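ERR on first pass: missing label on line 2. Operator R.T. fixed the label and resubmitted. Corrected input:
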Amino acid sequence: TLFGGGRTKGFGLIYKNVDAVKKFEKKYRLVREGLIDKETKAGRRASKELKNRRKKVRGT
Amino acid sequence: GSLARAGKVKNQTPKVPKLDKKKRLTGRAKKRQLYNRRFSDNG
Amino acid sequence: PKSYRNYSKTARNPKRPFEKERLDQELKLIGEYGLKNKREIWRVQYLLAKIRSAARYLLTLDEKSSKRIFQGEALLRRMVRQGLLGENEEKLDYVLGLTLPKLLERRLQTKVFKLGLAKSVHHARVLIRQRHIRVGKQMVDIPSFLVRVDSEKHIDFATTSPFGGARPGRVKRKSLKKQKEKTEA
Amino acid sequence: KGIVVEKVAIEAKQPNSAYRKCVRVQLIKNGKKITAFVPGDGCLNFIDENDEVLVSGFGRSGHSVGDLPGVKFKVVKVARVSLLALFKEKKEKPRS
RNA sequence: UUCUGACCUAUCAGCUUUUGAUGUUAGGGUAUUGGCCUAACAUGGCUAUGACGGGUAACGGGGAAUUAGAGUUCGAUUCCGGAGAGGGAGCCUGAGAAAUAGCUACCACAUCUAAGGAAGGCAGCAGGCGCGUAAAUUACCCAAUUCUAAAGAAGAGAGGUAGUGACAAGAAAUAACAAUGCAAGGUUUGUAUUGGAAUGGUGGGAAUUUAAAACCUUCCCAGAGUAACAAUUGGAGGGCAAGUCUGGUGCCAGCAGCCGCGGUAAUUCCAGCUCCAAUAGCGUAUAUUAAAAUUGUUGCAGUUAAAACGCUCGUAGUUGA
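pass 2 clean. output:
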């Protein structure tokens, strides 16, 4: 809005079709839109599990 | 040594309650009051 | 790493604290222009002093000197924009001639008090803080905004203020009166 | 930071008469004993005999100050509470 | 690798050359030049225009603070460059390493072990202990900024975003106003009675913002009168702006940067009252710059205050019709 209201500044995008929206925008922006839901929620404990792995220590 | 008479005067004196008073002004308001009391009416 | 955004002191503390003539003069200035602190005077004083220093340096340089004509004209044009120098004057010795009441006269609170709206300098200062003023197209709550000449023609009320005709009165009292009237009737 | 060893009573230079209450403290850093001044009349009994003082300079670098001969340092916080705060009015915590 | 540029110290004056110091020749070695290293031969090289030592609470510079102009102090710390990864040393791979989240050993520390052996290096980010005058979360996120890859799509405590944060820096409330009554002025200006307006702060909801949330901004509800929604800090002889006001103490307690104050009227203590300076900031300490033309080139002083060598010759130095 900016001080004292009655006015709002932003930034806009208009794509050729929905396919373009699928192509050239990233997931949070899609979530913000409402196209697709938020994915996997492991966070940086994912990193901890990754570092828990050591190659050919387990069969996988 | 002659140490332990220390704290004499503060212990001796009476103790007085500090009263109420109507809120001393802050800021602009205090400055305006000062301006009037020093400079305006006097004469 | 450390942020690259800059920052600076606005003001310089005055030296020689208790000098009577200066001290009484500062109080006198506060009395006229409604400033909260000696600090407000000091920032304005510092601002004037920088201008005076720049002008002094410029006037040492010779006439027709390329840097001098360019920078001097530019600084003077900036003074015209601020409303510090009139039309007839256009020379660096009137820049040196600039003086602290003349600068205070260009505060937005002062301008409002002069133009009307409020009935007191102090009234103007609270009116500005409580968001009633507008420079046209833009709203402001800062009483140390300085007025430029092309903006002196558009001081107004804020359109979202009571005096602008927004939410029109005291909600509490008007509702209480209306409820009592409905109950009573 | 140091610890109080002994409570001492320095007598003034000639033109004044008083017994000035001072505090001998051993700095933690270097094992150095020094005599330090304590402002405030109740403050001599605001330090215990094996307490922790926060000592500072005394307005003058190493120079002797006023009446006191030989005192270069000043106590400004005791039992990690401020001396002045305890003294002034009792605005902050007594000894525990 | 050329040139040129530095802090303090003469109670450090001769240093360097067998163990390469300086050169010549020839080699070896290097990615390449070279005492870089071997052999043979010269006997040089550097030094009061301060070598060789010692000190440094010394990484260098871009720069920082203070400056009228000279200056003086500061520069671990955003960028650039160097150096190092507990202390030393030696190595592999590869274009690039004498690499430290590569390796081998020693010393100094030190974890697991069934005692046979094994594993170790936070000055990455968190967090702990200790040291201390002295310093934040075992946070969330790879969205942006960028990097690395078999390069969109994966990773990144690089990095961003919050949390903690009175380190600094900017903006800015703590009322405003009209009536009367009183006050002073030639219908005025000031100030205690009243009494309707104005509004953040604040609580709630949103709108929005956002990696996600929170903040910001914006809107709608709520929502000040002792506007208790309560401004503090340090002062009031002089220096130095404000008390020969009121009580207590009575040379004691104490204050006091300094001069001094305190022995029965304390303009200085201890209070209270009043007043004053700055103000969401204000005190104190230590260091440092100005003030200091008290380090003096600009710009000091040397008859007597500090200071002309006992006297002359004279080499370097500086200066020269």
